[PDB]
Amino acid sequence: ARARKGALVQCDPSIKALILQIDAKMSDIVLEELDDTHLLVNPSKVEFVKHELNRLLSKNIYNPM
Amino acid sequence: PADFVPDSVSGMFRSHDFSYLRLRPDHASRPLWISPSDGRIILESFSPLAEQAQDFLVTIAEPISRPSHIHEYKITAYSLYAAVSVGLETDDIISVLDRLSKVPVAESIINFIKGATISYGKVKLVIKHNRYFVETTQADILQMLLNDSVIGVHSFEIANESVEVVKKRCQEIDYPVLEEYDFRNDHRNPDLDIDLKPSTQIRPYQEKSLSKMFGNGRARSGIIVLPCGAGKTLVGITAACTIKKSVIVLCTSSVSVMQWRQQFLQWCTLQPENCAVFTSDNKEMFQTESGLVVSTYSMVANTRNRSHDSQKVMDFLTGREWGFIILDEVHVVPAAMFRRVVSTIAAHAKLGLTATLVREDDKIGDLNFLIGPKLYEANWMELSQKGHIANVQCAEVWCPMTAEFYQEYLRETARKRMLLYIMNPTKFQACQFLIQYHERRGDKIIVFSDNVYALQEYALKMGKPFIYGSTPQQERMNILQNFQYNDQINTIFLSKVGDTSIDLPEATCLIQISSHYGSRRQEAQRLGRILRAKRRNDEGFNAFFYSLVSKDTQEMYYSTKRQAFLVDQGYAFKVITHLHGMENIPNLAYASPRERRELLQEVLLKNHPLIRKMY
Numbered sequence: 234a235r236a237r238k239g240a241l242v243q244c245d246p247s248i249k250a251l252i253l254q255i256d257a258k259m260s261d262i263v264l265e266e267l268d269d270t271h272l273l274v275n276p277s278k279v280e281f282v283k284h285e286l287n288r289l290l291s292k293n294i295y296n297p298m
Numbered sequence: 299p300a301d302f303v304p305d306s307v308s309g310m311f312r313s314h315d316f317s318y319l320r321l322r323p324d325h326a327s328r329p330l331w332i333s334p335s336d337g338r339i340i341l342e343s344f345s346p347l348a349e350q351a352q353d354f355l356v357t358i359a360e361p362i363s364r365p366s367h368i369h370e371y372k373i374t375a376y377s378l379y380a381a382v383s384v385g386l387e388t389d390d391i392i393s394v395l396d397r398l399s400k401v402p403v404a405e406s407i408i409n410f411i412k413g414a415t416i417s418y419g420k421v422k423l424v425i426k427h428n429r430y431f432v433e434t435t436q437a438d439i440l441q442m443l444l445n446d447s448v449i450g451v452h453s454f455e456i457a458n459e460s461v462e463v464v465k466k467r468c469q470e471i472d473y474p475v476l477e478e479y480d481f482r483n484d485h486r487n488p489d490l491d492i493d494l495k496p497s498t499q500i501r502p503y504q505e506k507s508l509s510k511m512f513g514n515g516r517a518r519s520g521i522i523v524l525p526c527g528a529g530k531t532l533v534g535i536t537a538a539c540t541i542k543k544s545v546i547v548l549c550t551s552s553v554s555v556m557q558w559r560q561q562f563l564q565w566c567t568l569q570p571e572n573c574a575v576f577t578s579d580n581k582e583m584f585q586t587e588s589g590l591v592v593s594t595y596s597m598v599a600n601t602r603n604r605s606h607d608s609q610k611v612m613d614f615l616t617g618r619e620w621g622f623i624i625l626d627e628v629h630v631v632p633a634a635m636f637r638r639v640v641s642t643i644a645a646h647a648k649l650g651l652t653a654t655l656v657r658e659d660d661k662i663g664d665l666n667f668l669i670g671p672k673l674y675e676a677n678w679m680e681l682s683q684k685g686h687i688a689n690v691q692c693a694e695v696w697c698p699m700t701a702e703f704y705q706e707y708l709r710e711t712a713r714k715r716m717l718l719y720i721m722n723p724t725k726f727q728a729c730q731f732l733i734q735y736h737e738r739r740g741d742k743i744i745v746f747s748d749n750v751y752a753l754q755e756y757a758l759k760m761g762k763p764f765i766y767g768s769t770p771q772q773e774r775m776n777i778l779q780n781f782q783y784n785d786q787i788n789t790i791f792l793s794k795v796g797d798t799s800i801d802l803p804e805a806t807c808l809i810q811i812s813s814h815y816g817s818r819r820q821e822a823q824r825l826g827r828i829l830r831a832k833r834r835n836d837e838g839f840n841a842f843f844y845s846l847v848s849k850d851t852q853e854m855y856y857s858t859k860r861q862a863f864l865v866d867q868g869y870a871f872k873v874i875t876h877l878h879g880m881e882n883i884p885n886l887a888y889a890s891p892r893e894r895r896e897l898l899q900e901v902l903l904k905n906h907p908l909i910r911k912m913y
């Protein structure tokens with residue numbers, strides 16, 4: 234009997250690996266690893282990781298002009 | 299723009315609002331819209347006078363994008379410079395534009411046209427006895443040109459190598475130079491008696507291009523752009539046969555030269571004795587007074603190392619004053635030193651033939667003063683719907699990278715991830731399933747791969763041959779002949795070697811697993827291989843072009859960057875997320891996680907005469 238507040242992130246192995254790299258550089262990002270598709274993350278860092286992940290993924294996308 | 303109230307949405311258009319003008323009463327008939335700022339022209343292809351405007355707009359304005367319904371051209375300084383040469387003046391252009399334009403021409407546009415349309419036709423570059431003379435029919439031009447820092451019926455000599463400089467200076471200065479060859483009155487150059495045999499046929503667009511080139515009656519110099527497989531060889535043969543003068547052709551390949559010569563002889567009545575091929579194997583030249591020399595840029599631009607026979611050939615080329623030069627795939631002439639051949643080689647007329655007039659660097663604009671402006675361009679979808687070329691269902695396959703390789707993708711540097719995302723198992727499995735399905739459909743498949751290691755791995759895994767730079771001419775020809783006429787074989791794995799300038803009437807399906815980065819020109823050149831399929835006229839036929847790309851990688855960036863020219867032409871790629879029925883195939887390559895791990899480790903590990911007896 235123990236409850237822990239947090240944010241559940243559901244994704245695929247690739248996004249999970251990206252999140253693992255981000256957490257390895259910043260341990261506080263991921264609070265815990267649930268499964269190969271689920272990670273428990275800090276509520277405060279959700280709004281920051283979303284924006285930073287969008288910035289990181291922008292590289293793989295070609296946006297002319 | 300006087301006393302014109304802006305709209306509430308005018309803010310969204312930053313100096314692009316064009317509502318300050320009014321529409322003419324005959325808007326329902328006039329099909330043209332003109333941009334007063336960007337120079338873009340919107341053409342209605344579904345309204346009267348559309349055909350009458352479709353060619354004039356091509357002549358005066360470069361095409362930006364020409365989709366099915368609404369065409370998009372653009373007027374530029376180079377386009378106006380090309381148009382002003384062929385008997386066209388601002389008065390006539392403005393008259394036709396006003397008669398066809400829903401809106402009146404703005405004073406700014408009039409000023410822009412006037413500034414550039416009145417600075418042509420005062421200098422002519424001629425050649426006499428291997429000497430380049432810059433002849434001007436007027437003398438007063440001297441008081442400014444000779445007084446300019448760079449320059450220096452009257453004629454003065456100029457260094458052959460300095461042509462590349464003087465032409466660019468002429469572009470900068472008011473008067474540019476025009477290269478016209480009156481072969482009718484040219485008697486000094488010996489004539490060559492070759493004519494097109496009755497079996498020859500000229501397509502309507504080829505005839506239109508030839509009319510645009512020879513409308514005045516005097517042969518000019520410039521560039522011709524036609525889609526790959528449109529008949530550029532026949533266009534060049536017709537030009538040579540009508541000029542009837544000594545000609546040298548430069549092609550960027552040896553197989554291309556062989557077929558060039560083969561088609562040359564087949565289409566025209568050129569006697570074999572008057573024909574010479576200048577390649578690495580045989581270097582003999584025709585002993586007749588006039589003939590054709592077909593060589594390559596490597597054999598014409600080299601200056602340091604030459605064989606004895608090749609040195610005699612080069613001396614022959616330099617000593618003789620050629621009459622015509624035909625540059626196949628001219629997009630490579632503005633290279634660091636290939637541009638030197640234009641200045642060194644002596645010729646009264648230069649024609650370039652290329653399906654794409656674009657290149658990565660900014661040197662594309664140098665072609666204006668290197669060889670001249672562009673003459674004609676042809677649409678792709680128009681010919682596809684008219685039956686001149688085939689229709690393609692271009693598709694982009696999204697192959698998801700598996701976690702085992704993606705985890706290494708994250709850590710690996712830039713150089714290794716390239717091989718990593720190119721050798722993913724999902725691509726192998728999709729390729730196997732597609733190969734089986736299309737072989738059951740009876741399609742002739744080509745698989746392109748720039749990476750030699752990936753090509754070899756795929757070939758050894760699938761038991762099919764691979765061709766790349768190391769393959770000899772005889773072996774590759776054997777591969778092609780068997781893939782063509784042998785019922786057992788239906789698919790081959792080609793590489794960058796067969797990207798362009800190869801005629802494959804039988805090839806129908808094209809697949810890309812490895813691509814040469816963002817190269818847009820190579821994209822189109824590779825697509826050109828299957829545009830001349832033998833069964834490209836049967837009802838319901840649609841060729842296939844597959845592009846395999848890994849999602850969530852920079853391969854998507856490069857893939858979306860390398861198709862911006864096809865999208866502009868009108869071709870649209872369809873994203874295929876899944877291929878139905880893939881699981882039912884009996885065997886799939888790299889289907890087991892054990893093999894996945896083994897391949898992971900393998901790919902990661904990839905990176906005194908009597909004393910002579912003594913010895």
Ligand SMILES: Nc1ncnc2c1ncn2[C@@H]1O[C@H](COP(=O)(O)OP(=O)(O)O)[C@@H](O)[C@H]1O
Pocket residue numbers: 499500501524525526527528529530531532799801803830
């Ligand atoms: N007018 C034509 N009549 C017959 N065949 C033609 C015609 N125009 C082009 N072709 C065919 O198109 C194919 C490609 O010609 P080719 O000169 O190699 O094109 P390109 O050099 O532009 O790639 C050849 O099979 C050629 O015979």
Ligand code: BEF
Pocket residue numbers: 525526527530653798799800801826
């Ligand atoms: F443009 Be072709 F294929 F020589």
Ligand SMILES: [Mg+2]
Pocket residue numbers: 530531626799800
């Ligand atoms: Mg060709």
